[PDB]
């Protein structure tokens, strides 16, 4: 039915125009619901046609907004699910020393069942990540964060009921989103503090631990985080302080820092330099990058829903999550 088409067009337009779901969990849920819907009301018989249809639609959605990789992750996850279910019904160096044109009957029902299982796991990821707060936080500890992330907020406020610590929050210069996080934390009695990015290194001598949130995790264990996290990681590495990253599994993309320049999302310079300056706006060149790149060497641990792990094992999670043929999409 054309209702699926109307929904797909609305989703692509809302992603390309402005931001859609505010939380990453809602974004992943909306993407998975749209994928399940595309699978449910559509004419497909064999796995190759369904996979190509999903690939074209996912390619469109990714071209709509390349920095929104949570949707590419969900598309690749659905593709991997389809491949696994098809291999279950149809039948490296160690390995080294395939058509999808057979049409079954119960393939759609089990694909939908797998998608629902993935949805429930997506829902439980938040508590699964927040449950590991006491294993890394201690009493009379100092924690530093940047920006506003729901995962880090839960991780911090889940341990305040049994531990007492001091939280330092560094705002983001273009979009001062750390103020909301600081207010939400102070509402729970955590003794929070707000500060600028210019005083990151100046205050990072009394800090004991750092917990932050990322937008996506690259293949070699590096991140695409908000602007200012590269400097935070540099200061942590200079003072040899562990930097924890609380990110669910859907924030993991199967790509290495191949690309160039289109990594960061550039928005209007109105936030950096207002339009009411004068005539100097014709000469002055202003750039406003929203995100930045954080190498893996400056990261210490990754707290996920399946337990903490080191960055040197993220490649295995990639091999476990996505299929090598669906990396380009």
């Amino acid at each position: 039915g054309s209702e699926l088409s109307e929904r797909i067009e609305s989703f692509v337009e809302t992603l390309k125009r402005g931001g859609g779901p505010r939380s990453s969990e809602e974004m992943a849920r909306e993407t998975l619901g749209l994928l399940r819907q595309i699978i449910t009301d559509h004419r497909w018989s064999n796995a190759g046609e369904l996979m190509e249809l999903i690939r074209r639609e996912g390619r469109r959605m990714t071209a709509a907004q390349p920095s929104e990789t949570t949707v590419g992750n969900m598309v690749r996850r659905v593709l991997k699910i389809i491949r696994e279910e098809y291999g279950r019904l149809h039948g490296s160096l160690h390995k080294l020393l395939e058509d999808f044109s057979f049409h079954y009957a119960q393939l759609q029902s089990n694909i939908i069942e797998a998608i629902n299982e993935l949805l429930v796991e997506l829902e439980g990821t938040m508590e699964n990540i927040a449950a590991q707060a006491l294993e890394h936080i201690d009493s009379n500890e100092v924690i530093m964060t940047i920006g506003f992330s729901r995962t880090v907020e839960a991780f911090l406020k889940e341990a305040a009921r049994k531990r007492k610590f001091h939280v330092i929050v560094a705002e983001c210069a273009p979009f001062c989103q750390g103020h909301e996080m600081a207010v939400n934390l102070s509402k729970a009695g955590i003794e929070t503090t707000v500060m600028t990015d210019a005083a990151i290194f100046a205050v990072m001598s009394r800090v004991n631990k750092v917990i932050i949130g990322t937008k996506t995790i690259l293949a070699n264990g590096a991140l695409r985080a908000v602007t200012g996290t590269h400097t935070l990681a540099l200061a942590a590495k200079h003072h040899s302080t562990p930097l924890i990253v609380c990110a669910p599994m859907f924030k993991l993309s199967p790509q290495f820092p191949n690309e160039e320049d289109s990594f960061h999302k550039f928005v209007a310079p109105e936030e950096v330099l207002p339009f009411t300056e004068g005539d100097i706006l014709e000469k002055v060149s202003v750039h406003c990058p929203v995100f930045d790149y954080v190498p893996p060497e400056l990261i210490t641990l990754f707290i996920s829903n399946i337990g903490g792990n080191a960055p040197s094992y993220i490649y295995r999670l990639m091999s476990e999550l996505y299929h090598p043929d669906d990396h380009v999409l």
């Binding site: 294993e135 890394h136 936080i137 201690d138 009493s139 009379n140 631990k209 562990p242 210490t300 641990l301 337990g307 903490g308 792990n309 080191a310 040197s312 094992y313 295995r316």
Partner: protein, 353 residues
């Protein structure tokens, strides 16, 4: 069985970890013929509290032998399955053993394997057969993960030790001692440097074992390690546990030794078994560690003890750490029965088991 009361004033940074005293034992408030606790477990807890069995594998072996004795002495009650009865009956014994002394990673892994095996027993099989199968599984596990794994690690480390080398060891680890003794018996001609630290002073065990074996050995304390490393060629260390992030959890004087070794450009090696590979993670020794008896810090220097009465000063604290954690950036190689693997391959081996 009542709670194990604490002893003395703990440190501000380690206020969440238990601090006990070896003179006050928990077996004081129990019946002489132990009724609620198994006699074997009572004797094991007493030995752990008194410090008679001090070692990762000695503790694991003693725990497994006590569990074999308990299973031999335990008869299942009626109107209930054995697969859950044994686990529910062993839970308080583990609680008591933890109250006597915090358990190590080896003991945790062994208890997890034993609980899995007990739960795997079917409700139809008989009792004697199930007990015999559990005892045999325990013995085969000991044989495969402790004795045969030690032989494989020694066989793999023999190629790394060469003639004229100067190896530096720390503390007391049976795996390192066996490796060195086998390398010396195989024809290698080297000399070892034993580093010790207070208050346990357990390095003297390896020192005397090597002297009895015939290996030229040296002895010195850990603060002077920066003085002996320039002449050291290799640093062999023992590990009690390997976390999922590659960090090494071992005796307290290992991370500092590895740090000083890297500064002096000396390749560091780590020997550990696959059953000591913990799946949890930790970044430093503050959130989870073990605080032993603080009275071990007292020393007879001169004719009087400066810390004879430390509890009178309400401002004075006594910190006695046991374990510590090392980052993967200070470990060069890890030796296991699977083969020589880097430290950033710890999760991969955890994958295969």
């Amino acid at each position: 069985v009542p709670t194990r009361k604490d002893y003395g004033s703990k440190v501000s940074l380690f206020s969440h970890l238990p601090q006990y005293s070896r003179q006050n034992s928990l077996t004081q408030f129990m019946s002489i013929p132990s009724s609620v606790i198994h006699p074997a477990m009572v004797r094991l807890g007493l030995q752990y509290s008194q410090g008679l069995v001090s070692g990762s594998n000695a503790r694991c072996i003693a725990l497994l032998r006590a569990l074999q004795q308990v299973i031999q002495d335990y008869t299942t009650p009626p109107n209930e399955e054995l697969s859950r009865d044994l686990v529910n009956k062993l839970k308080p014994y583990m609680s008591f053993l933890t109250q006597c002394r915090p358990l190590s990673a080896s003991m945790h892994n062994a208890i997890k394997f034993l609980n899995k095996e007990i739960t795997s027993v079917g409700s139809s099989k008989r009792e004697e057969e199930a007990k015999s199968e559990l005892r045999a599984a325990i013995d085969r596990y000991v044989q495969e993960k402790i004795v045969l794994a030690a032989q494989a690690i020694s066989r793999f480390a023999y190629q790394k030790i060469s003639n004229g080398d100067v190896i530096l060891v720390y503390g007391c680890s049976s795996l390192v001692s066996r490796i060195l003794q086998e390398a010396w018996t195989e024809g290698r001609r080297f000399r070892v440097v034993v580093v010790d630290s207070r208050p346990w002073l357990e390095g003297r065990h390896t020192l005397r074992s090597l002297v009895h074996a015939g290996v030229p050995a040296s002895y010195l304390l850990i603060p002077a390690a920066s003085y002996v490393l320039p002449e050291v060629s290799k640093v062999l260390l023992g590990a009690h546990a390997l976390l999922a992030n590659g960090s090494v959890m071992s005796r307290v004087g290992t991370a500092q030794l590895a740090l000083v070794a890297r500064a002096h450009n000396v390749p560091v090696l780590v020997c550990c078994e696959t059953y000591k590979f913990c799946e949890r993670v930790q970044t430093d020794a503050f959130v989870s560690n073990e605080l032993d008896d603080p009275d071990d810090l007292q020393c007879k220097r001169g004719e009087h003890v400066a810390l004879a009465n430390w509890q009178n000063h309400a401002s004075l604290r006594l910190l006695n750490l046991v374990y510590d954690v090392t980052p993967p950036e200070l470990v060069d190689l890890v030796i296991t029965e699977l083969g020589m693997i880097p430290c950033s391959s710890v999760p991969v081996v955890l994958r295969v088991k």
